[PDB]
């Protein structure tokens, strides 16, 4: 009884391209066999990208939901729930992307005449994996703004998948908000030569964001201020730049204003799109969620350079994640994080990486703000060390034999279903992982039993002014973490 209240659900990401670029569900029989294995292993559900570039390929509002309806039907038949990602991004240029799925060609056609609809770096390179926040409210897509495109897409999904939603097949809607579906700037593009652990680059040089910034600095009484010109390039280290070096530009009035403006754009981008997601799924028995990327490199140095270029204005004396958690609260949304499997010792010393501390900060911030926090492993891992670290983060203070744990993640999604995962040894270890995540209890079909009942999505609470959101930048002590989990996959 008490142990079941400690149950943390486990989901598994489906293979990329399960539904191909031509909107065809290629191998249902193959997938079926895999899903049945997951079902027998105790997995609660699966996660899948519902690619915008596949669905609305033909043209504006020309949606084809047929292949995905077939996929959802199979998932339901196999007794698994689903986390559906509204993927308004391209698959192909990020780590692990083994299939190329661009955004709609008709959108790219518009991009040919207006290159500024894409995130742009100082050098002028255009990244076509996602539409810049700069055009969120620009009615340049055959009369629609980018946010309207996202809104219409989600509404169409809600209506065309109404039966699956009513039956409870979908656990949550992961609202894609940028590259790799994450609320972030494409500051570390492998497509432009970035290599870990480069500090990355600011991506606010498209004409819309640049004009936005210029107007902002003018209103601040400094019209002459320009975007950073001393931040170096993708593969630099912080000390080699005028912007991130000690006493550098990042701590000057100009630098602080820019960083605040830059990170604020993401806060409002997510807030505005979540407003549309709430409207689209209002009344549905599903929860909303967003994804925040885990930029752990340089976390251990004063400048947190990589986080800053990604859009997370997080420093040792400024919490850049709690404001995101606070923004999510009005939407009753889940903050889906990552790097749950990483240990600092596994990263190269020169990267000044702190994934363990970063995870502790983000999860603690979410709990401090009274919102649900879920997460994923950042990279493919099949070993016990990885699973034990995930289980530790899932319940930082262990299991409570007297009832529910004071601290527990809302769920964990494993990246990713593959042939390797299903191999004898790998899968046997994975089964132990599932068992421990479930607090040694057998798979529990009814989430209500472990206090995960889903009620109709209510309208979002009143808008929270930016000043109140930023009050959450006040540094706070993280919740204490055990050094190791009390539920290891082995002994
Ligand atoms: O289907 C869902 C979704 O899947 C894919 O996106 C997911 C990413 O695959 C996943 O990594 C994560 O996104 C972030 C991640 O959170 C973040 O940490 C970062 O990843 C870093 C590593 O942390 C870092 O260690 C380094 O990895 C090196 C590694 O050190 C080295 O030893 C060797 O293994 O090479 C690795 C590759 O460089 O760099 C990576 C970045 O390259 O960035 C990730 C990407 O933003 O969560 C994503 C969302 O689920 C698909 O890409 C996406 O389209 C799908 O929607």
Domain boundaries, the chain: 1-491
CB of residue 121 inside a 6 A radius of ligand 1: no
CB of residue 377 inside a 6 A radius of ligand 1: no
Nearest ligand 1 atom to the CA of 97 is 52
Give me the sign of the Cα torsion angle 148, 149, 155, 156.
Answer: positive
Give the other-Cβ count within 10 Å of 167's Cβ: 11
Give me the sign of the Cα torsion angle 18, 287, 134, 260.
Answer: negative
- Whose CA is closest to 336, among 398, 411, 400, 240? 411
Way the structure was solved? X-ray
Distance 338 CA to ligand 1 centre (A): 9
Distance 41 CA to ligand 1 centre (A): 26
Residue with tokens 């002014």: 465
Distance CA 183, CA 311 (A): 9
Buried b (16+ CB within 10 A) or exposed e, 447-476: beebebebeebeebeeebeeeebbebbeee
H/E element, 327: helix 322-329
Resolution in A: 1.6
CB of residue 172 inside a 6 A radius of ligand 1: no
Indicate the CATH number of 1-491 among 1.10.3720.10, 3.30.365.10, 3.20.20.80, 2.30.130.60: 3.20.20.80
122 burial level (CB within 10 Å; 0-12, 13-18, 19+): middle
Q: Which two tokens stand for residue 194?
A: 């970035």
Distance 185 CA to ligand 1 centre (A): 14
DSSP β-bridge partners for residue 116: none
CB of residue 437 inside a 6 A radius of ligand 1: no
Nearest ligand 1 atom to the CA of 176 is 56
What's the length of the chain? 491
Buried b (16+ CB within 10 A) or exposed e, 246-269: eebbbbeebbebbbbbbbbbbbeb
CB of residue 339 inside a 6 A radius of ligand 1: yes
Residue 424, phi then psi, degrees to nearest 5: -35, -70
Residue with tokens 């509404």: 155
- Whose CA is closest to 41, among 448, 452, 438? 438
């Amino acid at each position: 009884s008490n142990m079941l209240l400690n149950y943390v659900p486990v989901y598994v990401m489906l293979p990329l391209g399960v539904v191909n670029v031509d909107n065809v569900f290629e191998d249902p029989d193959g997938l079926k066999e895999q899903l049945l294995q997951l079902r027998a292993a105790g997995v609660d559900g699966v996660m899948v990208d519902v690619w915008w570039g596949i669905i609305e390929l033909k043209g504006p509002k020309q949606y084809d939901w047929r292949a995905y309806r077939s996929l959802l039907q199979l998932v339901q038949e196999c007794g698994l729930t689903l986390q559906a990602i509204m993927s308004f991004h391209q698959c192909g240029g990020n780590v692990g992307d083994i299939v190329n799925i661009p955004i709609p060609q008709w959108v790219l056609d518009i991009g040919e005449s207006n290159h500024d609809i894409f995130y742009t770096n100082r050098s002028g390179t255009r990244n076509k994996e996602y539409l810049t926040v700069g055009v969120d409210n620009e009615p340049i897509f055959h009369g629609r703004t980018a946010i309207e495109i996202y809104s219409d897409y989600m509404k169409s999904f809600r209506e065309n998948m109404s039966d699956f939603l009513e039956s409870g097949l979908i656990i949550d809607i992961e609202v894609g908000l940028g590259p790799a579906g994450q609320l972030r700037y494409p500051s570390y593009p492998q497509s432009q030569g970035w290599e870990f652990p480069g500090i990355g680059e600011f991506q606010c040089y498209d004409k819309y964001l640049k004009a936005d910034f210029k107007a902002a600095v003018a209103r601040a009484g400094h019209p002459e201020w320009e975007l950073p010109d001393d931040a170096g390039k993708y593969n630099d280290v912080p000390e080699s730049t005028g912007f991130f070096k000690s006493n550098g530009t990042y701590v000057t009035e100009k630098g602080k204003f820019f960083l605040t403006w830059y990170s604020n754009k993401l806060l409002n981008h997510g807030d505005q799109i979540l407003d549309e997601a709430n409207k689209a799924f209002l009344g549905c028995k599903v929860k909303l969620a967003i994804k925040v990327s885990g930029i752990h490199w340089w976390y251990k140095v004063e400048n947190h350079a990589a986080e800053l270029t990604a859009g997370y204005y997080n420093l040792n004396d400024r919490d850049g994640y709690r404001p995101i958690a606070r923004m999510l609260s009005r939407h009753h949304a889940i903050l889906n994080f990552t790097c749950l499997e990483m240990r600092d010792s596994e990263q190269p010393s020169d990267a000044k990486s702190g994934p363990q501390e970063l995870v502790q900060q983000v999860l603690s911030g979410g709990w401090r703000e009274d919102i649900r926090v879920a997460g994923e492993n950042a990279l493919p891992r099949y070993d016990a060390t990885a699973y034990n670290q995930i289980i530790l983060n899932a319940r930082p203070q262990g299991v409570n034999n007297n009832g529910p744990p004071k601290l527990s993640m809302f769920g964990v999604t494993y990246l990713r279903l593959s042939d390797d995962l299903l191999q004898k040894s790998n899968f046997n270890i994975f089964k132990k992982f599932v068992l421990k995540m479930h607090a040694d209890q057998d798979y529990c079909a009814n989430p209500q039993k472990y206090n995960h009942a889903i009620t109709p999505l209510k309208p979002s609470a009143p808008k929270i002014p930016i000043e109140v959101l930023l009050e959450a930048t006040k540094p706070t002590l993280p919740f204490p973490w055990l050094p190791e989990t009390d539920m290891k996959v082995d002994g």
